[PDB]
Amino acid sequence: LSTTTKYIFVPIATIGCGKTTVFNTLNNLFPQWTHIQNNNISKKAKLKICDLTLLALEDDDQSVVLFDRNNSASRERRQIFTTIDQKRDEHLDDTVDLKYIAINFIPEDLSEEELWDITYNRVIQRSQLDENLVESVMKGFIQRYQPINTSRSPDDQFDHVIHLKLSKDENSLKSSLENVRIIIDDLVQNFPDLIKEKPADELINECFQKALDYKP
Ligand SMILES: Nc1nc2c(ncn2[C@@H]2O[C@H](COP(=O)(O)OP(=O)(O)OP(=O)(O)O)[C@@H](O)[C@H]2O)c(=O)[nH]1
Ligand SMILES: [Mg+2]
C-alpha cells in the first residue's frame, strides 16, 4: 500500500535434498506464494529463473517466491543477489523491500558420505546408462557444493537463514515434513507479518502428504 516487503526463499542444497517436496508443501499451504522450478525452465528460454522471480513479485498479490534451484556453489548464490539487485528497478518501484531468506538443506556437520547415502537412495527409489547419468549429475552438484558462510561474500547478503535437518526418516517422520514445520515456526517467529494464521498441524500433514505422493 505504501511499503511492501517481498521474500525470495533460496535453497542451498544438492539433488534430492527435498527442495521440491518442501516447496510444494509450502505452496499447498500458501497458494498465493509462487514456486519457480529451475528444472522446468528451458535452457533456451527467454526469461530465466531470476527474470521469472522479479515478474512474480510485481503485483501486490505476490509477495513470496520459492526459488527452486540447488545453489550448491557459492557463485550460484552470488548470481541471485547480483542479478536481482541489478534488475529489480526494471519492475519494482522504490517502495518494495526485498528480503533474501536462505533455506539451508545440508547441515554443517553432515558428512559427504551421509549426504550421498541419503540423497542417492531417495533419488534411485523414485536405462542403466540413464542411472549412470543421474549418479554423475548428482556427483557434480556435490563436487561443487560450498557450505553457506554468512561471514563472507556472497552469503553475507542473506537477511536470514533457516537451518533444516537432513537424516534418514525416524519414528515414521519424514525429514522434509520436519523441515516444513521448522520453516513455518521460524517464519512466524522472525517474520510474523508474513504468515497470518499458522496452519493447523493436520493441514500441514495433508499438504505434505500431497507433495510426498506427487508423481510428476
Ligand atoms: N524417505 C523420504 N523421502 C523423501 C523425503 N523428502 C523427499 N523425499 C523423496 O525424495 C525424492 C526427492 O525429493 P525432491 O523433493 O524431488 O528433492 P529435490 O531436492 O527437489 O531434487 P531435484 O529436483 O532432483 O533437484 C522424491 O521421491 C521425494 O518424494 C523425506 O523426508 N524422506
Ligand atoms: Mg526438485
Side-chain angles (χ1 to χ4, degrees), residues 13-24 35 37 39 68-70 105 118-119 121-126 138 141 166-169 173-179 208 211-216:
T14 57
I15 293 178
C17 285
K19 295 184 300 300
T20 299
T21 303
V22 168
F23 278 172
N24 279 350
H35 182 188
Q37 287 178 250
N39 279 328
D68 192 340
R69 190 175 81 168
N70 281 308
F105 282 79
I118 290 171
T119 55
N121 283 305
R122 285 183 182 171
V123 168
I124 62 111
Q125 253 178 359
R126 62 156 206 203
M138 286 184 73
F141 279 100
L166 187 55
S167 320
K168 44 173 248 184
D169 311 320
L173 169 62
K174 309 249 165 297
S175 65
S176 290
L177 174 55
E178 185 166 17
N179 286 337
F208 176 73
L212 190 64
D213 300 335
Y214 180 62
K215 304 269 192 300

Side-chain angles (χ1 to χ4, degrees), residues 78 81 148-159:
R78 182 190 304 289
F81 297 121
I148 190 171
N149 184 340
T150 56
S151 82
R152 53 157 207 249
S153 168
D155 297 328
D156 56 359
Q157 307 174 76
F158 282 114
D159 294 280

Side-chain angles (χ1 to χ4, degrees), residues 73-84:
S74 69
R75 185 163 69 190
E76 292 164 327
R77 284 146 247 168
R78 182 190 304 289
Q79 180 191 39
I80 293 164
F81 297 121
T82 67
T83 298
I84 298 286

Side-chain angles (χ1 to χ4, degrees), residues 50-169:
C50 288
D51 306 297
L52 298 169
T53 297
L54 279 172
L55 292 185
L57 294 172
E58 280 179 10
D59 308 322
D60 283 5
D61 251 336
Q62 307 160 308
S63 64
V64 171
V65 165
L66 311 176
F67 194 102
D68 192 340
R69 190 175 81 168
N70 281 308
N71 311 305
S72 72
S74 69
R75 185 163 69 190
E76 292 164 327
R77 284 146 247 168
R78 182 190 304 289
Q79 180 191 39
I80 293 164
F81 297 121
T82 67
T83 298
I84 298 286
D85 293 357
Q86 295 180 144
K87 297 163 87 151
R88 61 153 286 163
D89 288 6
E90 300 173 3
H91 313 117
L92 309 171
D93 71 36
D94 280 342
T95 75
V96 177
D97 172 40
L98 226 41
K99 289 185 184 303
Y100 296 92
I101 302 179
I103 309 298
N104 190 68
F105 282 79
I106 302 171
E108 199 199 346
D109 62 338
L110 192 72
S111 69
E112 180 191 320
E113 170 179 52
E114 204 165 326
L115 174 65
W116 175 261
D117 286 346
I118 290 171
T119 55
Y120 186 60
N121 283 305
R122 285 183 182 171
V123 168
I124 62 111
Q125 253 178 359
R126 62 156 206 203
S127 100
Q128 206 281 139
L129 193 141
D130 284 339
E131 279 186 310
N132 293 175
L133 174 88
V134 164
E135 171 160 359
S136 172
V137 166
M138 286 184 73
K139 283 180 172 156
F141 279 100
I142 286 165
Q143 290 170 23
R144 297 187 298 268
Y145 167 56
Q146 299 165 302
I148 190 171
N149 184 340
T150 56
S151 82
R152 53 157 207 249
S153 168
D155 297 328
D156 56 359
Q157 307 174 76
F158 282 114
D159 294 280
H160 186 59
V161 181
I162 304 175
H163 298 92
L164 304 182
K165 291 168 181 180
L166 187 55
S167 320
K168 44 173 248 184
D169 311 320

